[PDB]
């Protein structure tokens, strides 16, 4: 249960006369903020999304982000003109931090272009990604001439961000520690082959995300369990399906076991009987 603060930006530049920047902020697995291009401010998704920041501190960050958005779009379009990059361009920003209790804090600011890392903020300066195109080196040089932006980003990453994470953890402690019980059910699946069965175990509605689901005979875990991806529900719960390829005779006495924090040490066990 680690709760990193991830601020994500998705900027698309097509037609040179069409661009959009969208953003969101995640605390762990919960989306805490949304930033749409047609709105002037970042929108809070939770009653505790402001953390322990005062009203003025949050509005200060809002002004910072409006300037950041307009300046980023203009700087990217100027970069496209100075070098030979063809539109459309797909820039992504992943920035944020993680707080160790009482010891240290760490942060990151990674930029991707067409899905590939191109540069990052290290220490006090911009550094290009390993095996980066040659023109990115010219971009680093211009960015490193701007000491005010480097100072502001360093202030945000090393000072503002850890306090924001701490405030969000304290203020939204009730929702982060929330426990929602999953409901599970068994099913049949497309036959793998002749004389065989695909046992399916659905588990849906659990929060938080960590979960354990396996097919098994009593206490022995069937090492052939095929866990799928943990997929999101609209109400911020999760869904997971677990399957097992089995001889029809072996399906007798087999059960699906679910371990989740909401269960208070007990497990949900579903036996193959219907």
């Amino acid at each position, epitope marked *: 249960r680690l709760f990193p603060l991830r601020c994500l930006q998705i900027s698309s530049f097509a037609n040179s006369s069409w661009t959009r920047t969208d953003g969101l902020a995640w605390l762990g697995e919960l989306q805490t903020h949304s930033w749409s291009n047609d709105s002037d401010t970042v929108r809070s998704l939770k009653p505790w999304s402001q953390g322990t920041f005062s009203d003025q501190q949050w509005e200060t960050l809002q002004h910072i982000f409006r300037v950041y958005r307009s300046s980023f779009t203009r700087d990217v379009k100027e970069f496209a003109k100075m070098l030979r990059l063809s539109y459309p361009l797909e820039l992504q920003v992943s920035a944020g931090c993680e707080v160790h209790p009482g010891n240290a804090s760490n942060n990151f600011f990674h930029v991707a272009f067409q899905g590939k890392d191109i540069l990052s903020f290290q220490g006090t300066s911009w550094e290009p990604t390993q095996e980066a195109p040659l023109w990115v080196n010219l971009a680093i040089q211009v960015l490193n001439q701007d000491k005010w932006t480097r100072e502001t980003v360093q202030w945000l990453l090393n000072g503002t961000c850890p306090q924001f994470v701490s405030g969000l953890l304290e203020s939204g402690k009730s929702e982060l520690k929330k426990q929602v019980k999953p409901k599970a059910w068994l099913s049949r699946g497309p036959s793998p082959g002749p004389g065989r069965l695909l046992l399916v175990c659905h588990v849906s509605g659990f929060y938080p995300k960590p979960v354990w689901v396996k097919w098994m005979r009593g206490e022995q875990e069937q090492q052939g369990t095929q866990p799928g991806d943990i997929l999101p529900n609209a109400d911020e719960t999760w869904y997971l399906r677990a399957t097992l390829d089995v001889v029809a005779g072996e399906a007798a006495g087999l059960s699906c076991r679910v371990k989740h924090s909401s269960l208070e040490g*007990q*497990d949900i*066990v579903l036996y193959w009987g219907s």
Partner: T-cell receptor
Amino acid sequence: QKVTQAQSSVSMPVRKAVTLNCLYETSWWSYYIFWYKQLPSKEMIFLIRQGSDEQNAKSGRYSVNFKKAAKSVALTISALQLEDSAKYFCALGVWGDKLIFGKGTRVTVEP
Amino acid sequence: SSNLEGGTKSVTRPTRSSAEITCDLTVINAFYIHWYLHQEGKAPQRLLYYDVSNSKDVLESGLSPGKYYTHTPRRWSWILILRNLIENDSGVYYCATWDRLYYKKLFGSGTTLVVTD
């Protein structure tokens, strides 16, 4: 092969670093010391492992201070949370066999 | 609710009878199932262990044979049976095992045995 935890009950405020003492008397060349946590509902939970071969180990907020000559394994918990209040146990054993436990030390995190 | 099983449990039995203690632990490839007893104010100690592959019980020295029996009602499921229950048998009984690479020893939820006549 004996394990002793001299401290019985220890109290400490939040966000501090508490230390539990453990002294073992063994003759094995190779062995392991485990630190477990016991909950009010009587549930054992593995916290840390420190064998006689490696250096001092840590995992998250749990660290271990190891001295072979004086036979000391001191557990250190950093930045205590309100859920840390529990009974911590020190155990000594070799792989695939029994564990020799101490009587445990109760740690109470005060607000 | 009707499909929940495991977790912390208690078994209350009179003296001079037998007690069954369940194991909610989960294994990948377990050759042995250890049984530990924890009494209030005392260090947890292992009483015996069960050889699963060969279905045997090995008791710690000083324990009378037949007092403890590990039973396999269903495949890969284990229950500890205590005979001739005395007041001193009260305490929390855990089932435990080493993981696949013998890194750590996992313990079960535990069952509080209360022996009162």
